[model samples]
Target: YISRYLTDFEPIQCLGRGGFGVVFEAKNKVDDCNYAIKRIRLPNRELAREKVMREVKALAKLEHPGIVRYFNAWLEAPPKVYLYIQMQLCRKENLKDWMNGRCTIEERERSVCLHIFLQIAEAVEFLHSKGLMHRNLKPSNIFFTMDDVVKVGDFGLVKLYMSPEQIHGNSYSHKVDIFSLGLILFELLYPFSTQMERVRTLTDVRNLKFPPLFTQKYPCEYVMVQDMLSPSPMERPEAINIIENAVFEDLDFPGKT
Candidate 1:
């Protein structure tokens, strides 16, 4: 039903692509500002279904400082149809790329790491309060503003966690986001130069074990993250409780005291 087309945005750089679609850093004609536009090829106009439109609009209504702002959405006509989603664009790198770019020496400052995670935790808590779950909570979805503020994006796999009929299957809950946050915490806290080391440490985390050095260096953070990775959802702490605990008080940068 959209009357707009790709030409309106004036896309420039190809940010990246995946099963979801290709993302481009584009300039909006009206606002005269850059935005990230995700374009997905649809089988037909029918595939740009009402359900999809509803979800996108609902996401657009989600306004938070820690979240990437979802803006306009439009569908292009078919020889091959495409659905475009416009979102807030952070000019800097994503969390994954930023982490990879940093050296082990930078890992000495654990406060900054905790500071970043705290923002992510707060954001997740906000989403949970609204009865939503960001099913896709990877580092790649974590972006930053020019001020180095954490802005979690990519809600493609978001789902409503509340359900009464979960007796039949392994249903998801808000804990899924907690588990992902735990893994992200581990990635930031643990230092690994190579892919093999990264995999090994991650495997260790899955086994409910931590490197002796990591345990010694960050006992409190390790305990919290370990609780987050608990196999039982009931055992994991609520996001609000984590926020209230105020564990990461020692922020490297100037933060509200």
Candidate 2:
């Protein structure tokens, strides 16, 4: 019963909409605590039913601050099914909106962005460690809490590997997530610059030029980008290596006393 955990209050505002469904700003009517409610409206009734069960099953097994928390799920009569995800209320915009001037953030804010990226990388790494893949990883899919903490959202595309065949034949796997993470890392470093002037899809991403941050001027960034953009998944570094050798190292150990 999601209503039990919720405050019993209606949503105050519509946060945003995406392929999966809509998000609302709601408060617990009883506790009076603020939270975001993600309600997924599946296109197919059968798939919707399956997705509901899948979301619960998947989320129940996953635990991480970078990943969205799953609260409860239920089905409303007369053809309405909902998947309820409870999450922290965030004040930040998605990476795409932020880069496209929809949201303004200063240059000094990049460090915060990098930290968030690192957190996402770690989350992806953790998922991979558990033989799971977040098939979808994008700027809009990542979020920030009111306290500026980073969280990766939307696990609807998540998949689990049961064997090597699943790893090699499936459309998704840990390596696929690495590719998705690479796209995000590139955007964080360069934003929506001329480099992406001719890009339209993930396959076209490699055709774009590497920005100055990755153009010898920033060797570490260059290496990181190259590692992530590697065409062959086997050629790419593991997510753990990406976190330790690339992300943490690229930060230059700032604030270390």
Candidate 3:
């Protein structure tokens, strides 16, 4: 939830609607630029206020390169339209395509993809260290900022992955994100690979296949992709370890440090 607003920030286009709240892009009264705004009705004042303030506090503390920035937050009253918070406009993209064929694998293209991937990985690692889980670690939940930073705008906590512990429903650890990251990475590395699309079960996750071209060309990445997708939660690597240890140096990337 991020973007500037005008006093007349009329919602221009809806980004999402009808889940918990309605989100949309709004321009300033002068139409200078656009921003994202989330509007949630709150009749239950206490819990709603608590929830928003909780997020506000967390956002205030978070100053990571990969997390979205918070600008201002306050509750509406009297007329009480809805609770809204203004945030930095962190736009999302695929970090561009990881695999769109010839143009996609070029030095400039793949370098940025790897760069953004590592950035998000570092952010997720920070989250885990601080005793938090993103809950939803998929690609859509991640935003690619204009400078190629991978910012996770929302940790919607939707529980999209099946941690091995998920079988019990008792205690699950942040390791769930490790497995989840693997699943999302599968999508990134293989892009349009139909074989990876057969994912519906843990068995399917294991079976999610990649094209020979990708597997052969980036064998190092292929290895990590295979290792990261482990069905056993214990087998999954920590996000930081994976970022630092994975096959990134197949000879230094074009413009990397």
Error of 1 at 111 (Å): 1.1
lDDT of 2 by residue, 55-143 (tens): 66877787887876655455433325555666667664765555676233244254555676788899898888877777767766776
lDDT, candidate 3, 16-85, per-residue tens = 6654566666775664666666666664678876776686677677777787766556555542446665
TM-score on alpha carbons, each prediction? 0.85, 0.76, 0.72
What is the alpha-carbon lDDT of model 3 when measured against the actual structure? 0.62
Consecutive 10-residue window with the lowest summed lDDT within model 2: 155-164
Q: What lDDT tens digits, residue by residue, belong to model 1 across residues 44-125?
A: 4455566566667778879888888778888787546677888878855788777787749465368778888889999999
RMSD of each: 4.6, 5.5, 5.1
Task: Give the clash total for candidate 3.
Answer: 1
Q: How accurate is candidate 2 locally (lDDT)?
A: 0.63
Best by lDDT: 1
Query: Which stretches of candidate 3 lie above 4 Å from their native place?
Result: 1-12, 27-33, 43-53, 78-81, 92-110, 155-170, 193-203, 206-215, 249-257
Residue 207, model 1: lDDT of 62
Candidate 3: 10-residue stretch with minimal lDDT:
96-105
Off by over 4 Å in 2: 1-7, 42-48, 101-113, 155-170, 193-205, 250-257
**Candidate 1: residue 86 lDDT (0-100):** 86
